[PDB]
Amino acid sequence: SMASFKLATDLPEWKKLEETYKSVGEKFSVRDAFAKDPKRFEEFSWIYKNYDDSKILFDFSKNLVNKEILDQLVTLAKEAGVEKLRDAMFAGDHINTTEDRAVYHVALRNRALRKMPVDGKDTAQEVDDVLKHMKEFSDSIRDGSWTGYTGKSITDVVNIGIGGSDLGPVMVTEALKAYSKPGLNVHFISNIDGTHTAETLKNLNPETTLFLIASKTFTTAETITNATSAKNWFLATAKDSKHIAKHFAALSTNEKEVVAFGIDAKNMFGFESWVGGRYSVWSAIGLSVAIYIGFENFNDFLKGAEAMDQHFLTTPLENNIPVIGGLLSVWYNNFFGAQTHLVVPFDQYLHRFPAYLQQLSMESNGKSVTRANVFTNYQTGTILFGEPATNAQHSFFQLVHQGTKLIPADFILAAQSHNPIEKNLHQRMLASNFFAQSEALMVGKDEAKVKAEGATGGLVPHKEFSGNRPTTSILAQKITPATLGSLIAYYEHLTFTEGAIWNINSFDQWGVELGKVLAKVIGKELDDKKAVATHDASTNGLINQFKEWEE
């Protein structure tokens, strides 16, 4: 399973891209590119067709890229063996080398029931069987047939989990909230901070609340603590532990720990080690989604991911949409030295989409060691950030337009709103902003125009805009379950691409693994009341100041 090369900087096309950066890239004029190439929009935009014949336009043409540059980036991808690694992923090979695991989120959305084996054994029916369990259970919650311990239908579902066991369910239930039904609400406890439990459960009724304990390992400190506190809250009213079986289910890989916690095995929704947390919403972890919007919508979301998987698998690199996205990220990160990537949904439902992508991206690609087990001498993962528009335009877009940092940005809009109020007035205004913002980042406003518009003397430079600030625009028809499925999978495969070029393992997380063992030593120290002198002086000082100030 070893690597075909050591460092990205070893790939012969890397030095050629450095040369191209110097001669064409650094000074690249997007205005000039459009003037030189009447077909530029056609050449640097791609329509994706989803399984339901809906469409998404990916327009890359406002980026600092042309045919020469993209052809060089494609050659780099071939040298890096992006296709070989991708094929190994889809083959169920153990490409997560450091944990010796398969990387098989693609198998979770295999609705076609293709043969998709791990360790030589097809996963298709095992995955499907969990999905059938999810459909049966979510249907029974939604139709009222699953009753709580006093015989009432469930009104509230509380997911308890953190990281990969939280953020997908949050983001996707928010994104697809138009598909929810009145009277059936979802909630998400994740932070160990007791505020999260107290505020979430404050107004809920134990008789009509169902908890889903979401944990791959079922040993995570925060989650098991939160789950215990919720069980205590439930039993304060319900009294008898026999009633737990109607109110607690588990989403997990670890049957022994689930049962040991006192959940019935029948109420476990399983998944496997080859599902990374930040790739897990497609699994049993998405049960809150199926409950909130219905299993059929959840299934449509999976099929959207599957269609984008097939696109990534089958398309030559030069027309492969997630690959192009990933190649542009490498271009900016490693040649321009842009440390960040901005993601801006022009969509209020997608308000937690940037935060989700931040996990996906940064937890996958924030690595310093390659598959050849040497340290990198070049940049890896970027820092991702964002908020929805139009809010963002009034905020940090000031810096995006007039600051000193290059910030590659992705803007996303649906042509149709789920909420086309006031005869679509609000939607037309939203869309006008989408178009005009990316236009303005490209066109800018030169000295002569500032003067024509009435500024004189020392005010003029203050009102200039450089332009040639790059954007990618992604236009969907509508943010349906299927569309969101395809969009997430796009970003998954974009992340894949970047990581393949950098020659890192996109699929481990030894810093978040360390995080889950770090705090125990200090926790024991906070339990007894003596002052501490066992760490560095800052840690000791902070701890001791805390001890003086704590309740």
Add this chain to the structure above:
Amino acid sequence: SMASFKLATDLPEWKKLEETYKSVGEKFSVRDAFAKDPKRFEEFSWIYKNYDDSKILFDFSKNLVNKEILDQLVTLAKEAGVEKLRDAMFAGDHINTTEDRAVYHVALRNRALRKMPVDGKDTAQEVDDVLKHMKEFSDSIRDGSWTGYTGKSITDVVNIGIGGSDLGPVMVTEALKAYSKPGLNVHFISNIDGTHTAETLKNLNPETTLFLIASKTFTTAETITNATSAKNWFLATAKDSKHIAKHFAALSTNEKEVVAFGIDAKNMFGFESWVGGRYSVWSAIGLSVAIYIGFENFNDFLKGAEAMDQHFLTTPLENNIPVIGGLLSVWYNNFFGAQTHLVVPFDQYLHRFPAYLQQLSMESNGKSVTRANVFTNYQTGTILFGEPATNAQHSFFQLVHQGTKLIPADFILAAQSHNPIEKNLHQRMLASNFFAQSEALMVGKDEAKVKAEGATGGLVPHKEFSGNRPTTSILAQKITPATLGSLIAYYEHLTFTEGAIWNINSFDQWGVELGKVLAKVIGKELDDKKAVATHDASTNGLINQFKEWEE
């Protein structure tokens, strides 16, 4: 009002800091610094005492800084005239040069009624008079005496506004939600996206809902549109426009536009041009806060800001807490070339604190032109991001620990929880994470330790942690109104400092001003149905694809 210098790079200490970066900074060992200096925690931490005798510890000692470096940064601040600009701000001078305005958020929290003049006229009583109006109105909402058009008490208050007229109210009501009362809820419509209106108003009763239309200009497109749609929603039930007077108030500078919209002048809460939006929560814009948690709590929040103002005004630079913070930001941005700054509250109530600071920071300091009206040839504002812990630890902290990017970070914890459930178990665990995370970023884990812990061969590098990754830890006793007031003001004055060194105008926003006129041309084009060919080919293509896909 002109500048004493052109470019930061002209300041004699700038080149000296470049030299210090090369010889001491680049290779700085924080472990070595603690070993060399037994008093390092004491020397690089400061206790702030608030007006109510509560305290906040600011520990900078895990930063890449020592006495030599900090003394050089202080000298740079003196060369840049940070104190002169600060004194001009507090004097009511028109230091927002490009708009020729005073910068006088500090006057909003002048509870001491010091003489604080703009254009030679004291502002103290005018500010106070608005606050007395806010107290009377918020008291009458809270006590039930302000009734809606059918004679019922108000149960829901909806703020409508965007940017500076939204994010402060959102963040501060979230942060201080422990101080709210059952049955009186606040809501925030901001996005033009009609989803925001539809979802917010779905379950509200027009008879018991009060709107606050928050707009400095009272002409912002999104806000006036949202406000109109809310008025339409209200009148669909209420029928008669005479009932608007019991249900709509305005937070604004622009009395003529407010009345013209059909709000009663008596229900206007005014503020002045010298309040920037991203500095406005202290003004009439904070009315939702006063309603949600009570005017006395709002006033305590102002007094916390006032105390931090007095600290910033009166403290020599070497012990001036916001200045030190700002100097470290310049150090990382301009000498290390770190493009970002991470802010992580170990506090679920403060979940929107990073987003608020993102506006404050990036909208203030994302500028390319100095007070001498020349373009910069060095980096200005950083990109700010963050999410609360412990969630963030499971997410992008992977990259913070093991990626290739330097990411200066601020961690914030309260020693006491408003929600100390389970005999403070959750709070002790939260705090243990706070300490352990910053410890781990500093200490790292070398090759020998990885081997001792059981890794062999090619796995070892994958599990190494560099350490020497910097953090600032801020420990409060409790996040009270007063504490939050002081914390925001800290960041305001930190932002001030950075901008003063860069010699930019922290107080204009010509990119967000452009944003509010950009979209109108395209909006007219989306109104008629013909295809468009009036822009660049990408803009035209996106618009035309939208037209094919739109309802």
